Design a protein around this ligand. Structure first.
Ligand SMILES: [K+]
Ligand SMILES: [Mg+2]
Ligand SMILES: [Mg+2]
Ligand SMILES: [Mg+2]
Ligand SMILES: [Mg+2]
Ligand SMILES: [Mg+2]
Ligand SMILES: [Mg+2]
Ligand SMILES: [Mg+2]
Ligand SMILES: [Mg+2]
Ligand SMILES: [Mg+2]
Ligand SMILES: [Mg+2]
Ligand SMILES: [Mg+2]
Ligand SMILES: [Mg+2]
Ligand SMILES: [Mg+2]
Ligand SMILES: [Mg+2]
Ligand code: NA
Ligand code: NA
Ligand code: NA
Ligand code: NA
Lengths: 144, 103, 71, 83, 183, 142, 66, 152
RNA sequence: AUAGGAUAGCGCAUUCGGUCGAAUUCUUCUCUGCGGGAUUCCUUUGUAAUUGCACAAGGUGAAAUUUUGGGCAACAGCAGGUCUGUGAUGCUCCUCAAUGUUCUGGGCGACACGCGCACUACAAUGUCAGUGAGAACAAGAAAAACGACGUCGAACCUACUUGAUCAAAAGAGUGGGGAAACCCCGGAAUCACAUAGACCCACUUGGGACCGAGGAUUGCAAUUAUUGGUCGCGCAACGAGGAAUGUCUCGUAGGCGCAGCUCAUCAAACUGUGCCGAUUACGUCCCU
């Protein structure tokens, strides 16, 4: 009876929340909401999600089953949340089942390329105030 | 195991609803009944926005009046007589406690 | 700006005067002392008091401070 | 007056909507010699509509007289076959 | 197993360098896969200079109410534009874009009291070059059969060559001529 | 469609006393005829068995006759009554599809009938005013 | 054509509306050049800062101090 | 080469291939088999009142049936209203601001009925529609064919 | 593949919210009443200091300066607005063919014209026809009435089915929800699509104003179109707008929809909500 090697992480961007379950399997298999990476559209968002792999290399992702479930937000925010969950999932798995020279060299590579791969973006929608059509845009003034 | 009784505690006052929930939990622990856990249901905000002026002159300023509603539930497997004994105490004003039997 | 109001400055001076021996150059330990030795509603005010209290301690080690009377 | 903008005018285009023998032969002969091939360019050279220009460019691509470089639902970019 | 990024997995960033001695610290040649980063580049005064130059081009394409906020569309237009630039120049489109940005803005302008000739900061040169090239391409494709990526490619290539057929170069020559007359 | 231009191509096609551009696609050239919209033209092409991808300049005389026949009597070619612009005539109670100058003439008849009965809508038409209850104040301003 | 200069000091924003920055610029030339380590005062349009570089073209006119 | 199995990977299911490519292949199979029931009103109606013109693809009903089958596969128990939200669109209201409108449930009811007569969709217990075992088998086998690049 | 490029997988192959399975275990996501956390805290060959109060860059960090956005907000005033909010009010006017109060009908909408503020556009960074992935804030039914024999049960919102052996809008049947429970795994629109789709620079498949005919729906009543839906009308301007002029510095502007609110029926308004997401400056006292 082989032991179960599994971790669960989350990535956040705006309202979108992505939860990534990373487990040791027969071979690498990463899917977002049940969809393989190669079927994710557009290519721009697919490349953004694939950045979580190509920045450190697919060798560290080998034999890892990653399932990412994303809810809330939009297509861009969900992709950014998914890529953060994948990057954090790799770090957490190496933290739990490896040593500290790993999960640090990987962490430095992730942080050197993009801080938002691991640290969530705190930017949120500013509330609308009365007397304004939006957060800042005041009503049009006329003088005569 | 036995029948399940649901205690629904709702109040406009957060302090009052918390004190009633703690008192109910402490009394249940004294009676040694098996309680599930006090679940804090999402707080609901009643919002009413009105124009400040009573006549409609000047800058169109507004008032945002908010009323917050707090709700808790406690599940315990006790006979109706025991739940009545636990519930029978002096509660704060403005706090509503409801009794429901789960099926 | 981050100018400390007279409320923070007066409280910090009183704290240093009464509990000089228990304070040091570290904000976090100074803050922990201040939570116990002061009564206030505002956590933000207590944090500001601790910051200036540490500043007063640093100035005290270099020399005397006007308004600080250590017996 | 009432119309403040100048309202300039441009010479109208007379692009053909159906191929003819001369333009079709030109598309089959001189177009595969171009380094950059797009329906807008072919429309300019052959004085034809972009719709039939793109249809002709598609036919050359299937015949492998030209190769497709950049492809999208709205954008097709072609080039001449190497050598 | 970690390779360097290539824009759209096709164009290499190796050797990407601006010929101008100025603008070298204000044109970013950092490698990236796509011109889409959710970075807070406007937080500081000069942080926007570190943003990748192609992404800056993508942001410049997001003008008018019908174009505001369409960054995925801008990336697609840039991808087609780079392919057309490669076909036109037989050179790395990233290098062509860098050359166009380096040469697309006037070095001397006029301000102010009477009009007086003044130098242009390198940050403004990069900003204006992107702004004018995008403006020229957008206005050229307004009611023309030629598509926007084709118009953008022609503007960038002409700007890279320094040709007067570029909208940005034409404005740069006029501004410099007026600035020289205002010396 | 890569088909060469036929020798009989007409840039202007006569159909129901209307000049129809042969450069346009068949359904979008039929809509030039008054009484036929984009939806009706597509249905006319379907009932006539004409490929909508063809240009209108390649339509032969027989197909033009079939198109004119279908537009004249859509109900004969199994076009539903809810698809016609005049389903129950207020004067005759008959279902038909007006086309060409028939639409203008029947509009004149409708205006004449309302203005003869002195109905409110007829008075508004006679005075050249909005008839559908729209606020004419700060509107139109010729 | 144009001579490169390095901004070694920002003297301050000048003129009404504060859109022009007055700076001290050291001409960048090789050793032995007549303009080697020659510092001139210039007026700059656009956001500039210390250690920025300018293309001066003409290097004779000196901005009046303000 | 391209259709080579990546490694340790066998077969294919839905959600593992291109959604449009599967739908086109499924619609092509429906038309080629010629057993599905196509209502005559599909040649005269718009897919929804929110559209301004009729569908331009002559095989739009076969495409819609394939899309409905895949939607039922993804969301078992979905009804006509749920599918209407999926196939809705923004409507042009003239000089008035645009608004979203759900697709007409009529064509969706026809599509579900046609898929039912094919033995692929059955009324799910406690409301809604669901795929039969035949429908699940058909969808996954077609997904594998898409991956293998048969396409018909 | 019709012509089929680019894009990770190299002890155990993946998938199945209807498989309306069965056992376990748990709190990574979600809910929240109190707490924690950030303060100039740390470091400068820095600015200043020869004192202090502080400032600027970087560090630390989810967050680095009033953390962000709001609420509250002194003292003096205005003959500002409101007697069309109140059983808040002096003086004054009408008071039984009344300036009270009902009912009927009409008007508040009426157009040679001028002005404020919006909506839709002038198109290809597009319009149509498809396909895909996908938010958040929120709302939801009734009594000292009435029907059934002191308790439900119909008013409200919805899902599913049917209508359907043939348009939309309808009309029906059944079930659920007092609302983290049903709606709902909330399939919003911007958006995306290598969709081998149509259009190709034209007042044109741009733009839908004006108008005609059928039908349905709310209401006691739709004529002066209540409002949806269908087919016509598109030959109504409009191809980017003179002098002038408004708002705005970060998840902001702009775009994009959604909910609430007015509501029997009707949002181009407002109050909120989320989605896509920049350019520019981080300066000055020239204008106000
Ligand atoms: K209509
Ligand atoms: Mg859809
Ligand atoms: Mg529109
Ligand atoms: Mg519109
Ligand atoms: Mg709109
Ligand atoms: Mg007054
Ligand atoms: Mg009074
Ligand atoms: Mg009025
Ligand atoms: Mg678009
Ligand atoms: Mg239209
Ligand atoms: Mg009435
Ligand atoms: Mg009507
Ligand atoms: Mg038109
Ligand atoms: Mg209003
Ligand atoms: Mg001033
Ligand atoms: Na106003
Ligand atoms: Na164009
Ligand atoms: Na007006
Ligand atoms: Na940091």
């Amino acid at each position: 009876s082989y032991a179960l090697k599994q971790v669960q992480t989350f990535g956040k961007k705006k309202t979108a929340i992505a939860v990534a379950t990373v487990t040791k399997a027969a071979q690498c298999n990463i899917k977002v909401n049940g969809v393989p990476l190669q079927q994710i559209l557009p290519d721009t968002l697919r490349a953004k999600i694939m950045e979580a792999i190509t920045v450190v290399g697919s060798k560290y992702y080998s034999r890892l089953r990653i399932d990412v479930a994303v809810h809330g937000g939009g297509q861009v925010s969900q992709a950014y949340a998914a890529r953060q969950a994948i990057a954090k999932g790799l770090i957490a798995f190496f933290q739990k089942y490896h040593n500290e020279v790993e999960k640090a060299a990987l962490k430095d590579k992730f942080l050197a390329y993009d801080k938002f791969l691991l640290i969530a973006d705190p930017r949120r929608c500013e509330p609308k105030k009365w007397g304004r059509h939006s957060a800042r845009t005041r009503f049009t003034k006329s003088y005569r | 195991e036995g029948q399940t009784v649901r205690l629904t505690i709702t109040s406009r006052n957060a302090k009052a609803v918390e004190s009633v929930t703690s008192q109910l939990l402490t009394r249940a622990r004294d009676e040694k009944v098996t309680i599930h856990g006090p679940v804090r249901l999402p707080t609901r905000t009643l919002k009413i926005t009105t124009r400040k002026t009573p006549c409609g002159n000047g800058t169109n300023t507004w008032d945002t009046f908010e009323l917050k509603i707090y709700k808790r539930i406690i599940d315990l497997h006790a006979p109706t007589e025991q739940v009545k004994k636990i519930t029978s105490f002096t509660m704060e004003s403005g706090v509503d406690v409801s009794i429901t039997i789960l099926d | 700006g981050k100018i400390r109001t007279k409320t923070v400055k007066r409280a910090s001076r009183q704290v240093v005067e009464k509990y000089y021996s228990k304070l040091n150059f570290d904000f976090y330990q100074n803050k922990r002392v201040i939570m116990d030795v002061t009564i206030a509603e505002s956590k933000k005010l207590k944090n500001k008091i601790a910051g200036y209290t540490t500043h007063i301690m640093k100035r005290l080690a270099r020399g005397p401070v006007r308004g600080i009377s250590l017996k | 007056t009432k119309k403040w903008s100048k309202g300039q005018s441009r010479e109208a285009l007379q692009n053909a909507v159906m191929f003819d023998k001369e333009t079709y032969d030109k598309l089959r002969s001189e177009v595969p010699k171009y380094k950059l091939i797009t329906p807008s360019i072919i429309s300019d050279r052959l004085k034809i509509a972009v719709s039939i220009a793109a249809a002709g460019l598609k036919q050359l691509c299937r015949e492998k007289l030209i190769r497709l470089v950049s492809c999208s639902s709205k954008t097709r970019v072609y080039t001449r076959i190497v050598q | 197993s970690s390779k360097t990024p290539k824009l759209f997995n096709k164009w290499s960033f190796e050797g990407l360098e601006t010929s101008e001695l100025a603008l070298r610290d204000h044109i970013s040649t950092t490698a990236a896969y796509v011109p889409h980063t959710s970075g807070r580049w406007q937080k500081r005064r000069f942080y926007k200079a570190r943003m990748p130059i192609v992404e800056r081009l993508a942001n410049g394409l997001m003008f008018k109410g019908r174009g505001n906020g369409r960054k995925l569309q801008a990336a697609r237009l840039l991808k087609h534009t780079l392919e057309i630039i490669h076909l036109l120049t037989d050179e790395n489109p990233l290098q062509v874009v860098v050359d166009a940005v380096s040469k697309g803005a006037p070095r001397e302008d006029s301000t102010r009291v009477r009009r007086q000739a003044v130098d242009v900061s390198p940050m403004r040169r990069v900003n204006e070059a992107i702004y004018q090239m995008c403006k020229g391409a957008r206005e050229a494709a307004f009611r023309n059969l030629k598509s926007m990526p084709e118009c953008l490619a022609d503007e960038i290539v002409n700007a890279s060559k320094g040709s007067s057929n570029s909208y940005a170069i034409k404005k740069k020559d006029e501004v410099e001529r007026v600035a020289k007359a205002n010396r | 469609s890569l088909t060469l231009i036929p020798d009989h191509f007409q840039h202007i096609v006569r159909l129901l006393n209307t000049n129809v551009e042969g450069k346009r696609k068949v359904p979008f050239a039929l809509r030039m005829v008054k009484g036929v919209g984009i939806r009706f033209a597509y249905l006319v092409c379907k009932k006539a068995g004409i490929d909508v991808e063809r240009r209108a300049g390649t339509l032969t005389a027989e197909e033009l006759e079939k198109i004119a026949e279908i537009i004249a009597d859509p109900a004969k070619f199994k076009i539903p009554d809810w698809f016609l612009n005049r389903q129950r005539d207020p004067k005759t109670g008959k279902t038909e599809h007006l086309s060409s100058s028939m639409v203008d003439t029947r509009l004149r008849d409708d205006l004449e009938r309302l203005k003869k009965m002195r109905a409110h809508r007829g008075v508004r038409h006679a005075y050249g005013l909005r008839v559908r209850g729209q606020h004419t104040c700060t509107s139109g301003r010729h | 054509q144009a001579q490169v200069g390095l901004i070694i000091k920002v003297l301050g924003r000048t003129g009404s509306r504060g859109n022009v920055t007055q700076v001290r610029v050291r001409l960048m030339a090789e050793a032995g050049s007549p303009d080697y380590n020659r510092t001139i005062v210039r007026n700059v349009k656009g956001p500039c800062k210390e250690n920025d570089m300018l293309s001066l073209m003409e290097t004779e006119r000196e901005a009046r101090r303000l | 080469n391209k259709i080579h199995r990546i490694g340790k990977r066998k077969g294919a299911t839905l959600k593992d291939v291109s959604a449009w490519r599967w739908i086109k292949t499924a619609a092509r199979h429906f038309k080629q088999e010629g057993k599905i029931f196509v209502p005559n009103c599909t040649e005269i109606m718009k897919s929804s009142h929110g559209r301004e013109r009729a569908p331009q693809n002559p095989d739009w009903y076969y495409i819609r049936c394939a899309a409905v089958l895949r939607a039922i596969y993804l969301r078992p128990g979905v009804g006509y209203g749920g599918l209407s939200k999926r196939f809705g669109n923004k409507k042009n209201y003239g000089s008035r601001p645009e608004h979203t409108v759900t697709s007409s449930t009529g064509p969706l009811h026809w599509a579900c009925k046609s898929l039912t007569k094919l033995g692929l969709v059955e009324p799910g217990a406690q409301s809604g529609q669901r795929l039969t075992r035949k429908g699940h088998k058909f969808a996954d086998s077609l997904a594998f064919q898409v991956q293998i690049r048969k396409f018909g």
